[PDB]
Amino acid sequence: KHFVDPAWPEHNPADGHVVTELISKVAGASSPWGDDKEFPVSAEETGYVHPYTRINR
Amino acid sequence: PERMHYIKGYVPVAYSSPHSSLERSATWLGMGFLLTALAGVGAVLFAVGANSVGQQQEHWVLYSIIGVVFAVVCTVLGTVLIIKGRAPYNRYVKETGRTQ
Amino acid sequence: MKSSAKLMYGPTVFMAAMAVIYIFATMHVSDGGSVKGVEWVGSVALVLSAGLTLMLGVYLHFTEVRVDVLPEDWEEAEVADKAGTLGFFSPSSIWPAAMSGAVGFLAFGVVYFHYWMIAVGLMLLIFTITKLNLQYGVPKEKH
Amino acid sequence: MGKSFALLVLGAIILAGGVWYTIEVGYSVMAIVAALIMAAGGGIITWGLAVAADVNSPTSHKI
Amino acid sequence: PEIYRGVSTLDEPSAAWGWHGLKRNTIQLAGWISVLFMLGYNFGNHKGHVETIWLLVITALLVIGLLIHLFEPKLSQVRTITSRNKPVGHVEPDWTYDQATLTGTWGNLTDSQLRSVNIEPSRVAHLRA
Amino acid sequence: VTTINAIWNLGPYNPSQVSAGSQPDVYMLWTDGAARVMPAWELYLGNYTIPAVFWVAVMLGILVVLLVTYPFIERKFTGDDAHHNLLQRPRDVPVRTSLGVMALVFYILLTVSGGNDVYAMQFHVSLNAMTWIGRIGLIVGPAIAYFITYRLCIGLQRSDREVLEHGIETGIIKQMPNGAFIEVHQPLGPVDDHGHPIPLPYAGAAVPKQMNQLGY
Amino acid sequence: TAVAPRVDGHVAPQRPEPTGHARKGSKAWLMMTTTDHKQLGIMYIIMSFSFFFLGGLMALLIRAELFTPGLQFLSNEQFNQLFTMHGTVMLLLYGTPIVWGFANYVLPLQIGAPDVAFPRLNAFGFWITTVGGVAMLTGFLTPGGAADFGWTMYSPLSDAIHSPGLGSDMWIVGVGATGIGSVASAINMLTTILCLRAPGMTMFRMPIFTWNIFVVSVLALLIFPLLLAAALGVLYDRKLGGHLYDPANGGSLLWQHLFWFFGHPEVYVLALPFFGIVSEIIPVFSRKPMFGYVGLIFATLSIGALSMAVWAHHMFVTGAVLLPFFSFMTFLISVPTGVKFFNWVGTMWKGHITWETPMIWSVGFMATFLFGGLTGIMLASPPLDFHLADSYFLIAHFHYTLFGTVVFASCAGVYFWFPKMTGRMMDERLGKIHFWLTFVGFHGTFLIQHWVGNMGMPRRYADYLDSDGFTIYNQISTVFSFLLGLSVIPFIWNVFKSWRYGELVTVDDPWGYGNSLEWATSCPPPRHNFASLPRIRSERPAFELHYPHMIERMRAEAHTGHHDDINAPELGTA
Numbered sequence A: 001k002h003f004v005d006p007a008w009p010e011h012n013p014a015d016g017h018v019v020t021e022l023i024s025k026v027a028g029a030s031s032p033w034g035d036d037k038e039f040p041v042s043a044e045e046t047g048y049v050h051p052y053t054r055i056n057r
Numbered sequence B: 001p002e003r004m005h006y007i008k009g010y011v012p013v014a015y016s017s018p019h020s021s022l023e024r025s026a027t028w029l030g031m032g033f034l035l036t037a038l039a040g041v042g043a044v045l046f047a048v049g050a051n052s053v054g055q056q057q058e059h060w061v062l063y064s065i066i067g068v069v070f071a072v073v074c075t076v077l078g079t080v081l082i083i084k085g086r087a088p089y090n091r092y093v094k095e096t097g098r099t100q
Numbered sequence C: 001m002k003s004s005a006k007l008m009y010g011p012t013v014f015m016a017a018m019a020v021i022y023i024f025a026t027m028h029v030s031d032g033g034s035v036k037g038v039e040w041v042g043s044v045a046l047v048l049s050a051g052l053t054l055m056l057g058v059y060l061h062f063t064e065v066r067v068d069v070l071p072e073d074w075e076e077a078e079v080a081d082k083a084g085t086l087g088f089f090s091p092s093s094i095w096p097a098a099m100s101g102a103v104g105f106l107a108f109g110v111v112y113f114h115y116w117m118i119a120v121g122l123m124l125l126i127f128t129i130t131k132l133n134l135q136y137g138v139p140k141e142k143h
Numbered sequence D: 001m002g003k004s005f006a007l008l009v010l011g012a013i014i015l016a017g018g019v020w021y022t023i024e025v026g027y028s029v030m031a032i033v034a035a036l037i038m039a040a041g042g043g044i045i046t047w048g049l050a051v052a053a054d055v056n057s058p059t060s061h062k063i
Numbered sequence E: 001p002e003i004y005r006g007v008s009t010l011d012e013p014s015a016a017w018g019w020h021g022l023k024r025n026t027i028q029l030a031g032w033i034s035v036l037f038m039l040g041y042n043f044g045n046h047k048g049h050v051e052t053i054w055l056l057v058i059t060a061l062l063v064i065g066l067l068i069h070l071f072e073p074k075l076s077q078v079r080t081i082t083s084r085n086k087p088v089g090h091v092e093p094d095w096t097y098d099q100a101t102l103t104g105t106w107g108n109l110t111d112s113q114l115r116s117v118n119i120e121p122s123r124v125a126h127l128r129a
Numbered sequence F: 001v002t003t004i005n006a007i008w009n010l011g012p013y014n015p016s017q018v019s020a021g022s023q024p025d026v027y028m029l030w031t032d033g034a035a036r037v038m039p040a041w042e043l044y045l046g047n048y049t050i051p052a053v054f055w056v057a058v059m060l061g062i063l064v065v066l067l068v069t070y071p072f073i074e075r076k077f078t079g080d081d082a083h084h085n086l087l088q089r090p091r092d093v094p095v096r097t098s099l100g101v102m103a104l105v106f107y108i109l110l111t112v113s114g115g116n117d118v119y120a121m122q123f124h125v126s127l128n129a130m131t132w133i134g135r136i137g138l139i140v141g142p143a144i145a146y147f148i149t150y151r152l153c154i155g156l157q158r159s160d161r162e163v164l165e166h167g168i169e170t171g172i173i174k175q176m177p178n179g180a181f182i183e184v185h186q187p188l189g190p191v192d193d194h195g196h197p198i199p200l201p202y203a204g205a206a207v208p209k210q211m212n213q214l215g216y
Numbered sequence G: 001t002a003v004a005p006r007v008d009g010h011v012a013p014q015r016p017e018p019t020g021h022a023r024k025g026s027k028a029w030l031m032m033t034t035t036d037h038k039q040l041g042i043m044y045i046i047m048s049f050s051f052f053f054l055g056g057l058m059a060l061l062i063r064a065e066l067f068t069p070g071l072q073f074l075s076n077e078q079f080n081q082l083f084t085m086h087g088t089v090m091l092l093l094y095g096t097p098i099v100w101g102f103a104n105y106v107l108p109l110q111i112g113a114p115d116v117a118f119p120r121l122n123a124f125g126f127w128i129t130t131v132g133g134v135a136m137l138t139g140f141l142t143p144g145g146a147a148d149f150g151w152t153m154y155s156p157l158s159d160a161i162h163s164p165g166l167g168s169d170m171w172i173v174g175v176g177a178t179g180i181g182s183v184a185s186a187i188n189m190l191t192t193i194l195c196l197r198a199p200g201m202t203m204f205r206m207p208i209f210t211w212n213i214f215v216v217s218v219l220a221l222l223i224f225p226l227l228l229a230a231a232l233g234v235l236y237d238r239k240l241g242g243h244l245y246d247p248a249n250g251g252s253l254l255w256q257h258l259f260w261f262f263g264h265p266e267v268y269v270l271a272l273p274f275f276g277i278v279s280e281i282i283p284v285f286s287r288k289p290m291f292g293y294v295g296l297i298f299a300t301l302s303i304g305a306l307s308m309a310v311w312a313h314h315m316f317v318t319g320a321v322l323l324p325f326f327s328f329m330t331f332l333i334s335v336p337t338g339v340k341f342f343n344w345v346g347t348m349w350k351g352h353i354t355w356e357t358p359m360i361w362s363v364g365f366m367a368t369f370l371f372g373g374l375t376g377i378m379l380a381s382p383p384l385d386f387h388l389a390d391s392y393f394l395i396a397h398f399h400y401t402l403f404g405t406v407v408f409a410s411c412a413g414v415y416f417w418f419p420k421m422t423g424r425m426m427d428e429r430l431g432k433i434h435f436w437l438t439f440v441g442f443h444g445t446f447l448i449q450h451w452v453g454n455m456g457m458p459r460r461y462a463d464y465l466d467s468d469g470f471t472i473y474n475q476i477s478t479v480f481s482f483l484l485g486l487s488v489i490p491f492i493w494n495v496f497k498s499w500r501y502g503e504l505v506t507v508d509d510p511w512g513y514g515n516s517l518e519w520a521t522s523c524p525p526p527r528h529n530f531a532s533l534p535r536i537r538s539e540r541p542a543f544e545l546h547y548p549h550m551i552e553r554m555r556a557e558a559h560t561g562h563h564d565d566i567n568a569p570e571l572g573t574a
C-alpha cells in the first residue's frame, strides 16, 4: 500500500474523501498546521520561553 | 435541507428555492438564445433598408430570408427552452397553491 | 454554487453566436464603404471570449455536481449551520509590496532595455514570489 | 437668508472685475489670469447659492 | 503607562529602551536652517528660472509645514446631528440578539407579524405574557 | 568573471585629455558628489581669494567629525552613561535608527550625484536636473527619510506589543453559533480565568509573530 | 424557525473606536503589511483620488492654453503630452482603481464574509497598480517628456519610427502594470462571491452592487489580458525589430480592432459598478425597495453580454469595419441602460424622498448621464458619426458619461459609506457646496463644447486661428473649467476635517433605512466585519432587521395585484 504522511487527517474513503482538485471540507483555504488541530494550546505546550531581562541604569 | 417548511401566513421570497427556475441551466441558455434572436431582426431590417435606397440589389433577398430564418429559429428556441426551464415551477404551483 | 455555475451559459452562447454571425457577415457582405473579406482580429477574440466564459461555466458546473446542499445556498438556512472553521486567511505579509517593487524594477528594465535590469528583475521577482509562497512554512530556527 | 446675500454680492463685483479685465487685455498670458478671476467670481456666486440651498432645506438639523 | 525622558509609553511603546523624542525646538531649528540653505541656493551662477520655480515652491511648502508645526493648530469635534444618527449618549441595542430571542426591539410583535416571520405564535404566547 | 578597471583601453595620462565618465572609485564618489553640488560660492579679498572648493572641504570635514565623535553627542542628548552589554534592536531606538537612515540617504545622494554623469546618460534624465536633484535632495530627502523611518519603527514595535498582549494571530478564522467571526489567537504566556492572555512585559528580544516559528 | 433562550446578563459587544484617534506609527507598518480588505480599500480610494487631482491639473492646463488663439505658454509637444497623460491617468489610474477600491471595501460586508478570498493577492494588486502609476508618470522626468500619441496610441504613430523617446515606452509598461493590478483584484471578487457567502444569503438575495461587481469581474478578466498581449506586442515591435504592427502588414487597423476590443468593455467596467452604487443609494433615501430587482440583474448581465460585441463602433470613419452590424449592436446596448433608468425612477415613484447629500449626488448623476447617453445614441449611428467622429462633440459626450458615472457617483458613494468606512459623518453644508460647484461648473464647461464640435473644431487641437469662428465658446468653456477645478477644494477640506473631528456615529445605520447587509454591523466594522449575523431572508437584511413590524407589509405589497398565496396551507413539518 501507499505511504501516508502522519500529518494527514484520518478518514474513511468508503463514505467520503479528504481533498480533491474540485472539492474540500472548507470554505476557505486549509490550515497550514492541519485542520485537525485545535488551537489554542498551553504556554509550555507552545515551546516559547519569554525572557526576563534588565539593563543598566 | 431536502424539503422546505412554511407555516400558514408566511410568504417568502421565492428565488433559489429547489423549485425555482433561476436555478436551472435551460432557462439561462434560453435567455442567451433569446438575446441572439434580435440579431436576425437587425439583419432583415438592414436588408430592406439597403433596398430602400437602391443598394444591395444583388443579395438583398438572401439577407432578408436568412435574417428571418435565424430570428425565428433563435426566438422559438429561446421561448421553448425558457418554458422547459419553468416547468418545475408550474408543477410546484400545482402542488402547493402558493405562487412565491 | 448552483446558480452562478449555470448563469454563465447566456454570455458564452451569445458570444459564440455573434462570432459565427460575424464571420459569415464579413466574409460575404460586399457593402460599399467597406471591404469584403474575413477579419481574423475580432473573430479570434470573440471565439476565445466565448472560450473563457465556457471554461468558467463548465468548470463550475463540473464542480457543482459534486458539492452538497451548502447552507449559504439553502433559502431557509440558520446561522448555526455554518458554525466551525471557515478557513485559513493570511493575517499580514510584506511580500506583496516586495514583489510589486520587483515587477516595477523589471518593467523599468524593459523600458530602457538594460539587459542587467531585466535579469536582476526576473531573479528578484522569482525570489519574492518564492518568499511569498513559503511564508507560513519556513522551518523553525534550527537551534 | 443669511450670509448668502453678502457672499453673492462680494462675488458679483469680483466676477465683474474679471470679465472687464478679460475684455481689456488682448490675447495674452494675462487673459488666462483674467479668466481665473472671472471663474473665482462665479465660484463665490455658486458658493452663495449653495449656502442658500442649505438654509432653505436644512438636513443636519441640530447644530 | 509611564513617561520616560519626556515621552509617554502610549505614544512610544519602547520609550524606556532608547532615544525616542526629539524636542520640537530642535525640529524647528533644523527646518529653518534648511530653509536658509535652500534660499541661498538661488544665488549661484545659474541662468534659468525653472530652478527658481522648484526652489521657491519647495521652500514655500517648507515654511508652511514649519509654521503649522510651530503653532500646531486644532479644530473642535463637531456636535451636530446629520440624520437618524443619535447623540453621544445613545445606547445601541443588539438587534441580532433581539431577533434571535424575540426580546427588546423584537418584543411584543403581534400575531400577524410573528406569522410573517415564520414563527407560530403558539410557541411564543408565554414569552410575551 | 568580471572585468574591473580595464586600464589597457584608457591610455596613459597626459593633462590635456579627459573622458565624460571619469569618476573616482565607488568609495570616493561621495566626495566627488559634494564637489558637484556646491553652488560655486567664491570669496575675493583684495590680493587674496578663497576658492569655491574650500566649502566642500569644510562640509566633508564636518561630515567626518560628526561620524568620529558620535557616541558623545549621543551621550549629551540621551542623558545616560551606563555600562551597556546588551544590544538594542534598531526598532526600539527610533531616533538613532532614523538618523542613521537619514545619513544613509544623505550619503547615497552624494554618491549618485557623483555618478550622475553616467546616470543621466543611461536613464535619460537631464544633467542639470540631476545636479539640482542632488542639491535640493541633500536637504529634503533626509527629512523624508527621518519621518518615514521613525514612523515605521514605531509601527514595528507596536506590532510587537500587539502580539505580546494578544498572542499570535494564527489566521484560523471560525464562525461562532451567533455568527460572529473570530480568529483563534494562540497565547504565549498564561491565560486569565476569563479565557484570554495576560500581557507579558516586552523584553527587547524578538517576539514570534507566526505559528510556523513555534514549530507547528 | 428557531428562537433561542435568553442569556443571563447579556451585553452587546464593544464596537470599535472611530477614526482620528490613531496613535503615532499606528498605520505605517500596518499599511506596509496589510491584508485586511477594508483598510486596503480605503487606501485604494485615497490613492485613486490623488491620481484624480493629478490628472485634472493637466486638464486645467489644457483649458488654460485653449482659452485664446496663439500658443501663450505651451508648445504643440507639451499640449499633446498633456492630453495624452490626462486621458491615461484619469481612465486607468483613477477610474478602475476607485472601482476596485469600493469593491474591496463593500463587497465582503454585503455578502457577509470576513475577508476576501485571496488577501495577499489583493495587496499585490494595490501595490502593483501604484507601481504602474509611478512608472506611467515617470515619463515627465524625461527631457523630451512623456508619451504624446493620445490615450488610444494609434499606430503607425506608436511605431519605433514614428514615436521615439522612452516616455512612449513608459506608457506601455505603466498601463500594463495597472492592467495586471486590475486582474489581481478581479480574481478575488469572483472567487469571493462563489465561495464565502453568508448562511441564508442565496445568490438572488445579494445587493445589486455586488451583482454588478460580479459581472464586471468576468468582463475585466476577459479584456485586461488582451490589452497586455497587445501592449507587449507593441513593445516587441519597438525594442526589437518587429513588424507585426507595420502598416504594410495592416498594423493600423489591427491595432485599432484589438485596442477597442479591450477598450469598450473598459468603459462598461467603469459604468456598471457606479450604477450599482446608485442602485444602493436610491432605495435607502426614498424608503422604498429596489424596483424590478431580478429585472435589473438581467439588465446588468445583458450589458455584460453585449459589451463584447459592440467594440467596433469606435471605427466607423476607418472605412474598414462593417457598418450595419456594429451600428445595430451598439443600438441594442442602449436598451438595458434605459431599463436601469426606468427602474431608478420607478423606485423613486411616490416615495418619501429625503435629500441628504448622497441622494443629491445620485439624482445629479442621473440627470447628467441621461444627456450623456442621449448623446451617445447619436454617436452610434454611422451617418451622424461621419461628421461627429473625433470632434469636440465626442469630447463632450464621453465627459458627460464618465464625469457622470464616475465622478458624481463616486462622490455619492464616498458620502454614502463615509460612516461605515470611518465611524463619522461628513459635513452636510460643505457637501452641498461641493455638489453645486461641481454641477454648475461641469454643465458650463461641457455643454457648450457640443457646439464647437458641431461647428468643426476637431479634438486634440492645440492652436486655432482667430478667423475660424469658435474662440468665444472656448472662452466660456475655460471659465467654467476653472470653476470645476475650484470645486474640489471643499471636498478635500470636508474629507480632511470629517476624518479627524467629524460627527461621531452611534447607531449602525445613520441614514436610517439601509437595506443592504453592511448596515447591520458596526460603524466602523470590527477587524472581521461581523460581531453577529442577522437572519438573512431577502434583499433587505438590515431593513427587515431594524423594522420587524414592516415585514408583513414588505412581503404583501411587493407585487401589483398580489396573489392569495399568503392564505395557502402549511407546507411541511420541522
Ligand code: HAS
Pocket (backbone or CB within 6 Å): G151, G152, G267, G268, G270, G271, G313, G314, G315, G316, G330, G331, G333, G334, G335, G337, G338, G339, G341, G342, G369, G370, G372, G373, G374, G376, G377, G378, G379, G380, G381, G385, G388, G389, G390, G394, G397, G398, G401, G402, G405
Ligand atoms: C463610462 C464611460 C462611457 C459610457 C457609459 C458610454 C456610453 C455610451 N457610448 Fe461612449 N461612445 C459611443 C457610444 C456610446 C453608447 C451607445 C453608450 C451607451 O451607454 C448609451 C446608452 C445610455 C442611455 C442612458 C440610453 C438612454 C436612456 C433611456 C432611458 C432611453 C432608452 C434609449 C432609447 C429610447 C433610444 C434613444 C432614442 C432616441 C430617439 C435617440 C461611440 C459610438 O457609438 C463612441 C465612438 C464614437 C467615435 O466615432 O469615436 C463613443 C466614444 C466614447 C469614448 C471615446 C474615447 C476616445 O475616442 O478616445 C469614451 C471614453 C466613451 C465612454 C463612455 N461611453 N465613449
Ligand code: HAS
Pocket (backbone or CB within 6 Å): G050, G052, G053, G054, G055, G056, G057, G059, G060, G062, G063, G083, G084, G086, G087, G088, G090, G091, G094, G095, G149, G150, G151, G152, G395, G399, G402, G403, G406, G407, G445, G459, G460, G461, G462, G481, G484, G485, G486, G488, G489, G492
Ligand atoms: C474619468 C475620466 C475623465 C475625467 C474625470 C476628466 C476630467 C476633465 N476633463 Fe477630460 N479632457 C478635457 C477636460 C477635462 C476637464 C476640464 C476635467 C475636469 O474634471 C478637471 C478639473 C478637476 C480637477 C480635479 C483638477 C483640479 C486640481 C486642483 C484644484 C489642484 C491641483 C493641485 C494639487 C496639489 C492637488 C491635490 C493633491 C493631493 C494629493 C491632495 C478636455 C477639454 O477640455 C479634453 C480634450 C482636450 C483635447 O484637445 O484633446 C479631455 C480629454 C480627455 C480624454 C481623451 C484624451 C485623449 O483624447 O487622448 C479622456 C479619456 C478624458 C477623461 C476624463 N477627463 N479626458
Ligand SMILES: CC(C)=CCC/C(C)=C/C=C/C(C)=C/C=C/C(C)=C/C=C/C=C(C)/C=C/C=C(C)/C=C/C=C(\C)CCC=C(C)C
Pocket (backbone or CB within 6 Å): E027, E030, E031, E034, E061, E062, E063, E065, E066, E069, F030, F063, F064, F066, F067, F099, F102, F103, F106, F107, F138, F139, F140, F142, F143, F147
Ligand atoms: C569615509 C567614511 C568613514 C565614511 C563614509 C563617508 C562619510 C564620512 C559619511 C558621513 C555621513 C554622515 C555622518 C552624514 C550625516 C548626515 C546628517 C546627520 C544629515 C542631516 C540632515 C538634516 C536635514 C537636512 C534636516 C532637514 C529638516 C527639515 C527640512 C524639516 C522640516 C520640517 C517640517 C516642514 C515640519 C512638517 C513636516 C513635514 C511636512 C514632513
Ligand SMILES: [Ca+2]
Pocket (backbone or CB within 6 Å): G064, G065, G066, G067, G068, G069, G070, G071, G072, G463
Ligand atoms: Ca492659446
Ligand SMILES: [Cu+2]
Pocket (backbone or CB within 6 Å): G263, G264, G267, G311, G313, G314
Ligand atoms: Cu464604446
Ligand SMILES: [Mn+2]
Pocket (backbone or CB within 6 Å): G317, G318, G390
Ligand atoms: Mn479615425
